[PDB]
Symmetry: C3
Subunit: 279 residues, 3 copies
């Protein structure tokens, strides 16, 4: 009954922009004037190739750098390799992915599938400390053939003392209906360690956050320590075994949650009601 | 020979209290005047339901909030849900648990088993920063049918710069005899990251701390980074392959151990002696 | 065709020294006057016993303490057990290791294989805060029968705000040719949490950094949070699917990389050239 990922690989083309935003932040977008923080999700299947035509519309040098995926040195997007982009410039980055498989020597090649991310490597400092602070980051998902696909995917980025660069105590909030298969991509950036926590839900601490069967010994968790550039993801069944509610998620570092690193996973009945909860 | 957990689920009733202590701290107990920090261990089998008649005996609002287990929103113990308890009041919290199994859609449902914990979510702040600092935390274990049961279970909580809210350099110490199966439940709370370390012993970094057989690829470790609200647990054979001794456990963050986050795992010969140890 | 580890255990002997260095650092060596920071790599097979004749050539007390391996209390290298070594002194430390297997009771005993380390436990403080800060640390590898052996092993230690006690922005750098099987042993020490990252390469988050086959659910990563005394290790195929290049590795905690916790993994073509780069 559950929707499943197909095999790659297709060659895919895509435009991407970096824009400085009116409030001082910086964001990526698939369309000029539609930059967001986090940047848009890129999802591919193992084997796919992605050619990203990237345009830097800003007054400063900027780049696109990615985790996990196969790229040649000319596409790591760092200053050292002159792989970043001049103001007003355009460059085509190529990301590639591969399936797992046996090497000639008999060992097993891992394969690209997982929850990754992309970000700037050049604004502010040669490690993109400025870019990253301002919002130049976004999620990437590489699916393995056979992976369980969600109804929806949300991205939660712990960037310094903010969630998704939002002001303290301003979410983001997410909504689902009891029974929705919800996917979270959880990314951390900046200076601090954090512990991501979801009330009422839990996942497996492995590649997919799901257990394929009774033989997987991965810890089942609802809390997880994370540091800069760490990424993981998982799927849950909204309100499974617990019912509808305004379920908090937050960083569990005590002063962080006290100072606003909090949001709500709003799980609704088919009638839209949530027990407790107003606003 | 090794005793294993049975199947649930029974419906179990329990009473619990929150008390302010003479010394300014706060603790939970199963009986009034027998509060402890950490609180008493709650251990159940997958499928069990637990109804906790909880009384807040303090002058401030307080709550019980649990990780991992199934509870409806009315039992999350947060202020927002009006799920906490007035001074002098009594509420019944329900914790449910479930076995893993196949969902209608063919996917695999995780199951409650693991090393979890409970704590206050309301004293001092809406995240229980005061509650937690003062001592309102305790361990929870949910067993899977077939899990290996220990001789004893000890709880070690790294709460800010303390172990079990104790003064620097005052343990706690634990005693065992060479050959004893010892379970540790290891929980972290507060502001800081820590690294838990035990001399002379090691465990698997998975759900149970134990490898089922030769196919489990989990790292075997004796050191592990933890943050606020992380919980894990494991079993070791006291002095297995290493003999009797005063084996330290400590946080390995250098200034933390220097400033007192240290205790002793006292493994004795059957005669009661420990090589190279006092007093 | 991939070279694999044999079964132990042989009884092995080894001399090791602690020396104060001209610039005020402290290091271990296998030979007096050839001390290094990190200390030299110790590699054994499961079942091997290692007798280390350790001489302290400094004016302060010092010891050798190891993680993970089997040692009796008389070889834990701590002051409390009078297991450290007086100035000019010599002591023989014994490290044993064991294969995994079935216990009498039917459970599975874990086995020593993994990425470990050794360090001083006595210089500066009873926890070796001075020793460790000055450079008294080195790696240990214990192989399981059948483990894949690399072309080379490099040791990367994040010690406080340094890599291998080096000056900010001075590497170390490592060189390989596309296709070389490169093993990293990654160790962390001191006060700080860190986040290890390699551009262009990835590994499995398990014991060996390698997936055995398609049944292993371990997250494949290129980024990893670590704390004091954490050790892990992995194997990668240099430039696998990405080609030649000056691939950065660094701590990804933004101020850390900015302030110099950066190195280069120089993957060369057979001709010696690196696209980039250049000297
Ligand atoms: Cu980088
Ligand atoms: Cu945080
Ligand atoms: Cu919670
Ligand atoms: Cu990065
Ligand atoms: Cu909470
Ligand atoms: Cu600590
Ligand atoms: Cu140790
Ligand atoms: Cu909590
Ligand atoms: Cu120690
Ligand atoms: Cu760092
Ligand atoms: Cu990177
Ligand atoms: Cu240590
Ligand atoms: O990066
Ligand atoms: O929580
Ligand atoms: O240690």
């Amino acid at each position: 009954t559950a929707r499943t990922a197909p095999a790659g690989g297709e060659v895919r083309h895509l435009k991407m922009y970096a824009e400085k935003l009116a409030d001082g932040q910086m964001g990526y977008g698939f369309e000029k004037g539609k930059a967001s923080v986090p940047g848009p999700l890129i999802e591919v299947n193992e084997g796919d190739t992605l050619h990203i035509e990237f345009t830097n519309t800003m007054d400063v040098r900027a780049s696109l750098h990615v985790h996990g995926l196969d790229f040649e040195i000319s596409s790591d997007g760092t200053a050292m390799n002159k792989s970043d982009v001049e103001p007003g410039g355009t460059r085509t980055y190529t990301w590639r992915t591969h399936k797992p498989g046996r090497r000639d020597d008999g060992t097993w090649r891992p394969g690209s599938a997982g929850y990754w991310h992309y970000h700037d490597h050049v604004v502010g400092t040669e490690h993109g400390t400025g870019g990253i602070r301002n919002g130049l980051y976004g999620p990437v998902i590489v699916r393995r053939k056979g992976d369980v696909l969600p109804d929806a995917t949300h991205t939660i980025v712990f960037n310094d003392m903010t969630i998704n660069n939002r002001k303290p105590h301003t979410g983001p909030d997410f909504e689902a209906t009891v029974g929705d298969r919800v996917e979270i991509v959880m990314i951390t950036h900046g200076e601090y360690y954090h512990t991501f926590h979801m009330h009422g839900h839990r996942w497996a601490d492995n590649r997919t956050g799901i257990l394929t069967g009774p033989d997987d010994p991965s810890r089942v968790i609802d809390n997880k320590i994370t540091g800069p550039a760490d990424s993981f993801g998982f799927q849950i069944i909204a309100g499974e075994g617990v019912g509808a509610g305004a379920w908090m998620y937050h960083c569990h570092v005590q002063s962080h949650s006290d100072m606003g690193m909090v949001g709500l996973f709003l799980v609704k009945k088919p009638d839209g009601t949530i027990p407790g909860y107003e606003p």
